[PDB]
Structures are given as structure tokens and as C-alpha cells.
Design a binder for this molecule. Structure first.
Ligand code: ZN
Ligand code: ZN
Length: 125
């Protein structure tokens, strides 16, 4: 098992950190841990990213920044204003994927319409 600081270091100095984290996971690597899990009722909306925790019965809630590879790596966000969609918000992850929230937020996309994760509850189809 690799620990957090070895993975994080490895990705942070990659020219493409997101590709390194994915390629690492694909090879069977141990996911980044110590994301900040939230106590909450699990009666929330199920929206992906929210101002307070919004988990439904099928989700967990985390502190957004602790689930963001770039925040966890202390590097610039790949958005040309450098702005973070998770910093200071709360992210709702499906409980099945809650063992790798950093990987989940990376690999996935919020539906422009729903508000929920495309492919994971987004009902729109
Ligand atoms: Zn971030
Ligand atoms: Zn949708």
C-alpha cells in the first residue's frame, strides 16, 4: 500500500496530475484517504455540490476541498481562473464510491440540469 503523501507527491509534480491519479487507480493503487466525512441526516437533496451537506440515503457527504485532487496536491486548478468548484462547499458521493472520493470527483461530472452526478442518480435520460 502507498500512503497519501507518496501518491499526492507523485501526482502533484506530474505534468498532468489528473492523468497520474487515474492511471494509478487503474493499476490497482490504494486511494487517497483522510477525506473529511460529514455527519448528516441523509435526507438531503442528493445534489452533487452544495453549500451545506445534502446527502440522500444512497450518498455520503464530504468537505469539498478534501475530495479535490488539486486542493489535496496544493496545485493550481486546471481552470484558467484557477477557481475551485469544491473548496468550501460539500460534495455528495455515492456510498459505493465513498472509498475514493478524490477519484470520484475527478472522473465525474455534474449534470447542468439535475444538479446531480451524470451517471449516478442523474435521472435525466
Ligand atoms: Zn480544489
Ligand atoms: Zn441531470
Amino acid at each position: 500500500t502507498m500512503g497519501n503523501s507518496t501518491v499526492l507527491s507523485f501526482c502533484a509534480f506530474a505534468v498532468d496530475a489528473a492523468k497520474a491519479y487515474k492511471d494509478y487507480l487503474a493499476s490497482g493503487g490504494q486511494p487517497i484517504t483522510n477525506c473529511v466525512k460529514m455527519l448528516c441526516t441523509h435526507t438531503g437533496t442528493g445534489q452533487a455540490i452544495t453549500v451545506t451537506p445534502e446527502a440522500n440515503m444512497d450518498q455520503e457527504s464530504f468537505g469539498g476541498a478534501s475530495c479535490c485532487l488539486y486542493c489535496r496536491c496544493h496545485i493550481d486548478h486546471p481552470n484558467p481562473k484557477g477557481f475551485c468548484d469544491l473548496k468550501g462547499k460539500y460534495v455528495q458521493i455515492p456510498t459505493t464510491c465513498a472509498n475514493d472520493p478524490v477519484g470520484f470527483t475527478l472522473k465525474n461530472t455534474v449534470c447542468t440540469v439535475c444538479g446531480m452526478w451524470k451517471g449516478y442518480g442523474c435521472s435525466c435520460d
